[PDB]
Amino acid sequence: GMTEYKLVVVGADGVGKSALTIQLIQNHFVDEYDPTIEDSYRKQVVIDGETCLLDILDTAGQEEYSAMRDQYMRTGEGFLCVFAINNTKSFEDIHHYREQIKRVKDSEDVPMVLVGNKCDLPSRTVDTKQAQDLARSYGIPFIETSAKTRQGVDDAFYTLVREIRKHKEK
Template sequence: GGGGVGKSALTIQLIQHHFVDEYDPTIEDSYRKQVAIDEEVCLLDILDTAGQEEFSAMRDSYMRTGEGFLCAYSITSRSSFDEVAGFREQILRVKDADHVPMVLVGNKCDIEQERQITSLE
C-alpha cells in the first residue's frame, strides 16, 4: 500500500502486540514470527515496505521474492484504495503469474467517522 495507510502499525501490532499511533515513514523493516496455521508451525518472514513513491524502484525486488502479499489501504483515503489496484497488477506482472496469494486489507477502521470507502467497495 501507499504511504501512511498503516502498514507498519499492522506489522508492529502482529509482532509486538502494541498499537503505534505516531507516523514514522518506513524505508524497509523486516520481521520474523513463528505461527501455527492449521496446526502446522510456520515461520513468517515479514517485509514492511516503503509506501512513498520515491521508493517505488525497490518494489519490483520485494515482489520478486515475496510468496504472499497484504495489499493495504486506508478506509479514510480514496486515493490509497484506488492505488491498490496498481500494486496488485505490479505484483502479477513481476511474479509473471495469474494467481499470487494476496489479501486486501482495509486499515484504520478505528476512525470510522472519517471513512471514505464503503464496505461494499
C-alpha cells in the same frame, strides 16, 4: 523444521502497514508516524494447528521509489495489499500495486489479501461493499482491520498464509 512463509506488506504511505506489522509482532500500537525505509521481522505462529514461521517484509510506500519495488516482489511469496478506509486515494492505489505484483511475478495467480485498515475511524470514505466487490473481482480475500484495536490483525496475516499454502497445493 517448520515451514517459512515470506509475506510482504504493501500499500500507499500512511495506511498502517507498519502499525499492522508491529501489532502482529509486538502486540502494541505505534501511534507516531515513522515512515518506513524497509524492515523485516520474524514470528512463529500456529495456523490451523500447524506451527510455521512468518517472515514479514514491511515496505516503503514512497511513490518516488516505485520502480525499485520489483526486487522484493520477486522474492515475496504472498502480499498484504493495504489501504486505509478513510483514504480514497490509498484504495485507488491498490490497482497499481496489484498490477505491479502480477507484472513482476509474470503471473495472474499470486497469493494476496486485500486489507482495509483503520476501521476504528469514524470518517470512512471507502465502503465495505466497494472493497468486497473489488476483492471479489480479483479473486482474493478481503479483511477490514484496525492496528489500533487489533481487529482483524491476526486474521489478515493468517489468511494470507492460508492463501500461500493453497497456491502451493499443500
